[PDB]
Structure formats: C-alpha cells, structure tokens
Design a protein around this nucleic acid. Sequence first.
RNA 1: AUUCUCUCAUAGGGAUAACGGUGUGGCCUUCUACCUGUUAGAAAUAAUGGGUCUUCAGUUGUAAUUCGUUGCAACUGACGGGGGGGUGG
RNA 2: AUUCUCUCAUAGGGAUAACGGUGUGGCCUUCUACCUGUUAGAAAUAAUGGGUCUUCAGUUGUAAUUCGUUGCAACUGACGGGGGGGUGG
Lengths: 163, 488, 488, 163
Amino acid sequence: DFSDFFGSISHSFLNEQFNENGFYISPEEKFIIRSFLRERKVGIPQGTSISLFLANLTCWKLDQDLEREGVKFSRYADDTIIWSQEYSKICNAFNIITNFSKSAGIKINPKGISLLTKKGLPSEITSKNNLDFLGYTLSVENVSIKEKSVKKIKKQISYILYR
Amino acid sequence: MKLEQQIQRVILEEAKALIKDYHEYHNRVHLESVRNKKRLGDSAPDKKIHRPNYWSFDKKFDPFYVKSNYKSIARSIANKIENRTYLPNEPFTKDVPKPDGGIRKVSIYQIPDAAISKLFFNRLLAKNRHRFSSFSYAYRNDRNVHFAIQDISVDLKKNERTFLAEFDFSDFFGSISHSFLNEQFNENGFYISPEEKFIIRSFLRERKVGIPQGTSISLFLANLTCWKLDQDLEREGVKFSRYADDTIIWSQEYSKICNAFNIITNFSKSAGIKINPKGISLLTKKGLPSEITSKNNLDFLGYTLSVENVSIKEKSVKKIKKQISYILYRNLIQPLKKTSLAGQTIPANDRDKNFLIAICEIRRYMYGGLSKSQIKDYLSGRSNRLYFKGIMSFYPLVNDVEQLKQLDGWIVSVIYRALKLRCQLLSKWGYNRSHNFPFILDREDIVDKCSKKTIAGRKLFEIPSFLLIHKALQKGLQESGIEKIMNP
Amino acid sequence: MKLEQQIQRVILEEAKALIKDYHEYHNRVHLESVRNKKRLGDSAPDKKIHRPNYWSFDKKFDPFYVKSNYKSIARSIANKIENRTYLPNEPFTKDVPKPDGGIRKVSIYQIPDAAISKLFFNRLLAKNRHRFSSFSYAYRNDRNVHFAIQDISVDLKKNERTFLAEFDFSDFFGSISHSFLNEQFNENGFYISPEEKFIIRSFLRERKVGIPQGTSISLFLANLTCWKLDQDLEREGVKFSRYADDTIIWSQEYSKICNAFNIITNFSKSAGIKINPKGISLLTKKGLPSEITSKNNLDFLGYTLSVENVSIKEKSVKKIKKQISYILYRNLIQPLKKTSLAGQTIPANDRDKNFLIAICEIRRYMYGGLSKSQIKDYLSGRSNRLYFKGIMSFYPLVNDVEQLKQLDGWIVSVIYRALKLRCQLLSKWGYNRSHNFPFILDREDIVDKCSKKTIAGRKLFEIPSFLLIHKALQKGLQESGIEKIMNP
Amino acid sequence: DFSDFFGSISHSFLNEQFNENGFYISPEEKFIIRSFLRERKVGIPQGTSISLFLANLTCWKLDQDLEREGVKFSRYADDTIIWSQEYSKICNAFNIITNFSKSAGIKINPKGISLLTKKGLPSEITSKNNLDFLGYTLSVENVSIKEKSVKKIKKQISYILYR
RNA sequence: AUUCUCUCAUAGGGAUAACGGUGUGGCCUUCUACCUGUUAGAAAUAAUGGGUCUUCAGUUGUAAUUCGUUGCAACUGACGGGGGGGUGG
RNA sequence: AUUCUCUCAUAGGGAUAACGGUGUGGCCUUCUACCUGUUAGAAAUAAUGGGUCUUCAGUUGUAAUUCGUUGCAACUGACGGGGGGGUGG
C-alpha cells in the first residue's frame, strides 16, 4: 500500500527526480509541476491528471530496482502487486521497497507475502489458492469474478426484479 | 558371438528360471500341505496346485512351451531383428490400485520379449551408467534404494534444516510422447547403437504413448527421458532420488526446493505431460518448531526418517505384527477353533509342538532362523560371518532402539495372550493343560524359561528378539556395507 | 575365511603377478635381442637382463622372496593386525620432477604392505562407493577418467560458456593433518570397521603428514579428506573431477566458479594446508570472443577439449610422432649408420625386410596389429567384434577428423623421407636400390602400392591410417561404451 | 546476430508459440500467418510487415528469460544488444540465448561481449571506451555520431560543393 | 634355488634338481560378403591360392509411419599434413 | 510330454518314457570361547551329551601416543511394549 507514500512524500525528493531516467521535462512543465505541488504541501494528489506522472517520477528508481531483480510488478492507484516465480526474488523485492521507503522519508506498508499454487498441490509458506485483483479472483486454473463483484451483480439483478 | 545364440541363451535362462520357480512352488505347496494336514487334522483343506493365469493368455507366457521351442523362437526373433521387423507381443497388464488413490499398470512381457529386453537394456544401462543420476531406481523394492535412504538419513542428521518435496511421475510415464524420448536418443553422451535404437523404438511402437513401468526397459527409458531434469536439479544443487514413478527432492535451502519445483514444471511443459506432487515440507528436530508447513519425520519406503533416527514405518510395523500374530494364531488357535480336533495332536507332557512350530516360524520370519548363539558369536568376534535373512534384512538402516524394544515387548505379550487363549480353547475341548509348560509361564517369565529350554541340544524355544539382530545388523553394516548384507 | 588366509591369497597373488611380469620381461628382452642382432648385425649390443633396483633395498620388495615365505609373512602380519601392532614398512620413494615445476613423490610399498593395502582399501572403496563423488580418480592413467572427460566434452558442446578452473592438491596431500583425516572417519555415512580404522591409522602412522599418492590407499583417503569439499561444490552446483592431485571444476556460470574458489579457500583453511591453482578461464566457441582471460581449448589428460571437438593434445601427438619416427629410424636408418653393415641384410630383389618390420611396428603401435579388412568388416557389419589395442585405444573420445587426417599425411611423408634417406645411405655403402620397390615409390603412390602388395596372402605393407581406426573406435563406442573398449 | 535464426527457424516452433504469452491470434489471422509462412519454407521474411510480429512471437520466451534475469535488451532487425550493470547477468544472458538457440533448432552467434566504463578508468575484461549503436557512438560521457556516419555527412557536403 | 617341506614364522632350517615363462606351427571353436582356377564330386560342398569393396553426408524416387523416424535403389561431396627455396597461371 | 530330435522355425512334425525339482540324514569343508562326565589313551586329543557368557555407554587406574586415539583390568547404566477396569503408596 503506497497510500501514505503519496500522502506524504517530500516534494524535494520529487524535485530531485526531475532530471533522472532521461525524463524530458521542459522548464514551463517544471513550473507547472512545482505550482501544483506548492498548492499541496506534502504528497501527490491522487486520482487526478497529475497523479500518474508524479507517481512514475517518484517511483522510477523503485521500478528500475525491481526490474533489475527480475520481479514483475504493477502499481494501480496506491496499490502495488509484485509477483515472481522465485521466493528469493520476492524477498529481495521486499528489501527494495524497504530501501525506497527510507530514501523517500515515508514508509510503505503491505496490505503480505504469499505463494499461489494449483488447488490440489500443498504449500510451504502462508498461501492462498487464488489472488483477488481488481474484481478478479485469479487462480492457477482460471480467472473468475471476485465474490464481491458477483455479489454486486446479484444485487443489481435482484433489485431490478424487485423494483 | 552371434545375436541368435545370445537370444537363445537369454530366452533359455529366463525360461529355466521360471520353471525352477514353479517347481519350487509346487514342492513348497506339498510340504506345507503335509504340515497343514498335521496341524488341522481331518479339517485340513486339500492341496490345489495352481499355474499362473497368464501362462494360458499366450503360449509364450508359459516357461515350459518357450523351453520346448526356444531355438525356433530365438531363430525367428534374430531374423526379425536383423530385418528390422521385430515387434514385441502385447504384455499382460493388470491394473493395481495404488494406496494414494492412483493406478499402477503392471506389464508382464512374454518370455522371449522379456529376454530380449533384458539382453539389450541391461547392456544400455551398463554402457551409460555414468551418464545417469545417482539414486535412480526402477522398482521401489530395489536393494540399492537404501543408499538413497542412507543419504537422506545422513543429511537429516547433519543439516540444521532439511526441506523435502515429493513428486508423482506416474502420469508422465503413462503418457510421454515417444517423440520426446526419441529426441533424447542423441544427448548427454548416451551410447545407443543403431540396433539398440531399433529395439527401443520397437518396444515403444508396441506401446503407443508412455514407458512401460516395472520392466527391464523402464529404468533406461526413464533415465533417458529425465536426463535434462536430473541435470537441472543437479545444477541447482538439490539432491533427488527417483524410485519407480516417485521422486523425492531434498535440500538444505527453501529457495533451492522452490526452484526445483520450477524445474519440474519446465520439464513437464517440455514433455507435453504434467508431473504432480503427492508435497513440500520442512524436516527439523522434534523439539524445534517450523515456519512452513512441516512434519517431524518423513516416510520413505518402509522407513520413518527423522532428524533423530531411522525407524520402520508404522505400516511396515503393522505388517510385521500381522505376520507374527498370524503365525501364532495359525499354529495355536485356528486348529482348536475347528469343528473337530480329529487328527490334531493335543498338547501334553509339558510339550507343545504347535508352540515350537510357531516360535520357529517367527524366528524364520525375523532372524531368518538364526540362533542367539550365532548372533552373539558374530557380535563378539567368535564368528566372522552371520547370514542376514528375515524381515530385518529389508530394514538394514534402522537405528531406533526404542521401536525394536517395543516390538520385543509386543512379541512377548502376544505370545502370552495367544497361549492363554490356546489353553482356554483346549479346556473347552476338554484338555486341561494350564499347569503344563507352554501354558503355565507368566509373561514376565516366558523369555527366561524358553531361553533355558533345549531340544536336540539346540535352544529352539528362545523368543526371537529384534534388538539382538539389530546389533548384528549394525555391526554387519559397519563391516560389509549395505550391498553385502541385503544379498549374500 | 580367516584373515591370515586372506592375507595369504593377496600376498601370493601380488607376488605371482610380479613374477609373471619379470618372466615376460626377460623373455621379451631375449626376443628383442634376437631381432636386434638380425637388425644391427655384429654391431648389435649384447643382452643385459636387469632386475628392479628396489628388489634389493629390502628382501620383501622382491617378488621371489615373498613367494618363498609368503606363508610366514601372512602368519606374522595377521598376528600383528589381531594384536594391533602391525605397522607397514617404509616404502620406496623416488621424487620425480613434475613438468609444471613441482615434484611427485611416488611410493612403492613392499609386497606384503601393498597386498594388505589392496585387501582393505578396495573393500573400503567398494563399501563406500555411493558416499564418494562421481569423477574421483587416484591415477591420471585410470581408464575411468575418460568418463569425466566425456562429461566435460558434452558440457562444452552444449554450453556456450563453460567457466573452468584448475587446482593443484599436491601439497594438500603432501601435508594434511592426520587428525583431520581421523575426524572424517565418522562422517558422510562412511562404513569403516574398527580393524579397517586400525589399518588406516597404521599406514598413516608409518607416514607422518599427508597421504601417500599413487597407491592403493590414495583414492579412499583422498575421498575421505575431501568429502566436505565435494559436498560443498555439489551444493553450489559446479561439476568437478579430481584426478591424482589435480582438480578441475567447471560450470556454466561465472558466479558458480567464483563461489567454488571460495569453497576451496575455506577447505584449505579447515585442513591446515593450502591448495593452489595451476587458474580461472572461460571456454567458448572459436569464433566468439570472451570477457575474461580465456582459451579456446582446455588440455585435459592427453585431450585438447574444445567446444567444437575433442582432439589429442599436441604433446601426445608429439609422442605418437616420436614413436612412429623412431620405429622407421631404428629399422631403416640406424642400422645403416653403423660403422660396419656386417650381418645386416641389405635390401635387394624388390624386398626390404626392414620396411616390413617398420610398417608392422607402426601398425602394432597404432591399430594393435589389425588389418584394414578387419576394421572394414567391423565398420560394415560383417564382423561383430574388433579388438581395440594400440595408441588410439588410449584416446577413445577423439572426434577430430582433421587432426587424424593430418597425422595420416605426416605418416606417409615420414615414410617417404626415411625411405629416401635409407636409399641414399645404402648407395653410400655401395648398394643401389633406388629402382627397387621400397625405394622407387613416390609419396603420392606409397599407400596405393603398399595396399596392393601381399605376402603370405595378407597385406602387411598397407600404411596404417588413424582415420579408419577412428571410424572403428566411434562405432565401438556407440556399441559398447568406453569401459568395454579400453580393456577387453 | 539473429540473421541465421530468422533465415532458418522451424515453422513448427513458430506455430508452437501461437498460443503462448497471451497472444490474441484469431483463426483467420492464423491462416494468413501460416499462408505467408507456407510461401516461404524455413525462416521469417526480414524487412516486411510480418517481420516484427513473427520475430516477437518466436522470441517471446527469450525476452521473458532475459527480463527475468534482469538484463535489458533491444532487438533491431536481426541484431540484439543486451546490456547490464553486472557481468554475471550478461553471462547468464548468453546462456539464455543458447537455451533458446537449441530449442529453436538454429544457432544465434554474437558479432561479442565488452565492458563500458569511463574513459579515464581502466577495465578488467576486454573493453572499449564507446559502443557503436546505429549511427551513434555511445560513451559513458556523451552520445556522438559514429565516425562512419560523420564520413557520410562529410561525403555529402563535399560532393555538394564539388558538384 | 623362484621347487618341496618344517619351525608359535615380515625370520630362520633342511631335501631334490626342478619350477616359472617366451616365438613359431598344429588341433579344438568364436564371427567373416562376393568372384574365381585346381584337388576331391555327381553341382552337395570342404581344405586350399589369387582378386574386389566394406565407411560417412546430402539430394531425389519409392514402401512403412504411432509423424521421432525407418528399408531399398542411385547421383555426387569429402575419405593420406605442414614447412623452406625457385617457378608458371 | 516340461526329454530327444527334425523343418529357411515367435509355428509345426515325429520317437521314447523320462526330465525337472523338494524335506530329512550321511561324507566332504568353511569359522566357532570356556567348563565338564563317559568312550577310546598314556594327558596327545577325537567323536560324542550337558552347562555358562559373548553387546553397548560412561567413570577411574594403567601402557603406547605421530596428541585423532588405542590394549587391559573393574564399578554401575540401560539390554522384552502399550492400552482398558478396579486398588495401594
């Protein structure tokens, strides 16, 4: 959960990233970024036109480190899922997020670490059969709708009939 | 040495071995029918010499027919191999229900086909032994599997932690593409001659998909098929053993076992058929806890291997107890539970022949018929060789004194209880023998009394003890190794 | 089977083998002296039958004395072992200069001590074979080292990048604490009996520091001291082979080789004595470049192994050339370079007996005496067995057609040049034979003419060809494996 | 150099990749791919509208393995450059390319491997100061035009004046 | 004496000339394509004395094919280095 | 006929009653501590018919010790389960 990261990230760190990773930011664009940040005081506004760019600009080194490790990841809003085929890789990814939290001055906390396997086969570490990702129950055998989303569908159909 | 002569020799020796086994079978049946007549009197069932059913499914399943015309069979087989038209006849297949809920499909080839399989695939296994992994066995009763057990036992004792995992290759060998097999023919330095390639392809063509399991060709084809899996697991650094269609992989690191799972699936996808675990656990000391799903002791082929010792699996202990208890029941209760005791010697004069027969049957089952003087002579140095037969021979690596001590107690207790029931039944039939020798001893005296009893100058009443033969087995392992004591 | 009888059998068999070798030695010396008389006429040296020097340093180095009183020797040795006072006598030690600049200290024990060493350490090696590594050899002429070579060859062909490193364990075995060796006596599931421990400790007490090298006890003690190094390297995932005091470790990863270096460093510390590399390199295809200090081909025990092929080491090719060239020189030039050619048959009538002797000597050295018809029958299927003797038998894995083709050309050229010099020398002595058969053929005709020539119905002029016997060796490897062709 | 790989890649391997890596290939698209391949016999046509897709479909597992290792790579036409900040990673990349080569039935050969450092600092392995990448001499200090490209510019200007 | 035999035997005693091996050739027998005189013989062959090739790769035709491949032609592609000094294309 | 023998032989022909094995005991011979009658016998033993222990761990003394350990006493510490129902400490 990167919610608190974007709630309070030092704008000085954001500014340090303005000239990294080959980002092409023009002087007027830097003024507009700094103005929208000056309106705020700490953190990036979330759910806005400026959220994606500023989030990518602050987390570019985290993305590079996770890609060097070899783990695959996805950041949706203030949520980040990192998956790998190796336990060591995920542990090293945890270490990367920990280091990035320190370099940013604000911490990132897990929702934490699990193993996804076939339904029949057992597991070593705290494990679940299926992950729940954005309205999907993803399993090794199939992709289905999350039970919450199925409840929502049932609610709408049932209320249509009731009404 | 021409191929026809070689086939002749192989077919004839296989046929003669089967004939000798059947001759010994019916001779044993007769001797046992004589003893059972003495035991059950007039109620003794009559003899019934059976011949194996598959002998009639095809005449060439029959040892006697093959011996009748092994020269013609070898002639034609050699001609068919030279002309590259030989194709093995269908084997007898019986589907046996595996306890795990699966199905093991046995295949009994005909004597000519089995002989050809042995002649060629023993050669290929010998010629390519160094290319194969260490602990690869085609049967789960193979004498060499204990070497694998030893390794894991050693590792368990030494390693602070031993992660283990298990896999079922049953479906892999049930349906592996024969084209994948053929792709492996020229890899990993395997020396497979053109005629050997023809025989491999012929035995595979007889099948359609998969490798026959429990056969002379099983080990070689499995090793040839799994050579890249073995190489990847060895590059990772995990240790593994494949016995029949089961594979155990153990390591000292969790990450290594995880990567081994990944390797098995890369291999599964490349082979077109999946391999499923039975799955993964951590083995630690009994006192210490675990972070992952864990068990204290693994069960590996009749052994409960723990970080503290090697013992017999509780299923195997149950089997031992079943056999000993039925020995006593057959010789001391069943005859007295018949409608009539006619022709059955009733114990008298402080002598029970039934009890001697039972004690001797237990001694054969456990020691192999050894005297405690023989075992003690070996344990002392007086004698330099003690044959190791019986049930303990199949558990050479057990080092659990407590288990053997408990089984000693159980043997004594069951002897006492069965003797008490024999006395009770005898008294119902109207033969009071409680005061006599075999029925008067208290449990805490049986051993002692029977140790002192002597017949023909030999102490044939001594209650057999697992711990004595365990002492001898440990000494014999430290003096001769596993291979020299599991067969003389 | 009492220990005294066992020692008796072993000592007698060793003494008898040495006696048979000496008898064959002096018989060979006589036959060769007769032939050399025929070759060099009156100038021929006189025979000189030598007896090995070490036979006199102690009477028990002499096979004949040991055979004289092997019963008393066995009696006393058995009594000393039972009373645990046996101590082997000092061995004969000669320090040979290793080409790398080091010194290899060979040890020749006396026949009794060598017999005891074999009796006990062969038993220990057999009983603990599964606890040892795969490619561990005590001599650099052991027939099984080729399996290790095969492995690396396969890896080199399949891997792109095969990082290799080499290590010299010479000083490790020259001075390894015997206390460390003793610490390993109860590890890795090694089954060492108390008497075997006494014999190990006795052979070590006879020494003071280190393991004797090139002996019956070298392999076992080396495996026992390096068992943890082997386990660590196998856990890392690197593959390795120890031949004598040489260890090659190869991997497909640079990190793995570096971690292997770290392992050897740690093992050196735990043993109290250091192990030094010869060091670290990358083996790649010839065309492709490299990062780190790299070489196209490694040189491993008479083989130049490359990613593209396996060939004979240039030193070994030099040795082959030396022997062939000296065969021709001895039979065709040296006799004619003597002061007097008295008693030497001068070639005439289009027959040169010297050339026949030389061609047959080269054929024995190369083929083992085979005819090209024999080899072609094996290559065709007409004949099902071809004995593999000669120099090529020591290089069963060569697959470099170009090298063998170049050596074929070199043989023909040297035959031509030596014959031309023989003609010139003969003409100096006053015997013009240039027009005669053995001195008229042009180089580009020798083979052909010599192929057609026949004597006694057998073609004994055919110029031996490495490539024909290479075809045969490849077929025999694909039909019988390495073990079956390096010894019949 | 992937020139030989595209010159002779088994069309059966290509077809094996048709249902991997979540590729959405419709039945008629599969027919058109197979038809253009049937017109050829072995290999993918290079420099064509179908080249990029067939190359990506055929090398998808090489890309996945190289990304799991953590190396970064770019395939331009029949050339592939793989760079990393670790030597071990590049070595493992070589190993990956060859596992792919064996699985594809045709070999991929390097042009091969070097280390790029600052001009002043030395190197341990065979090294060059600047790589030449598509008309660029890329150095740790700057990006410039390749001397061949500068020669072309000079040729054109000089011939303008000469003409 | 390196043979044979005794000593509570890694050493000492005796008694006899033997013991242990090597090359050649013979029989036995393991496997060995084809063409031939000339000896036997009723075409069944045997010992003999002369000769030829025998391997690998690809292409194409054909038959099988469990789609890994396999039997047969029949065409060419290799199947006996390198170096020094002159010399022609 | 499962024996013996013929067929260009995974199949078919013939001819004879044999072939192939098992338990017990006997000799041969591999290894086997000690104490004993009673048979032989001049104390050298042999076959016989009765009996005892024979293993592991630690402590201590002693001898060797290349400092891993090893031979010998001699003291105790284990060396034949578990469960159900009552019952004493």
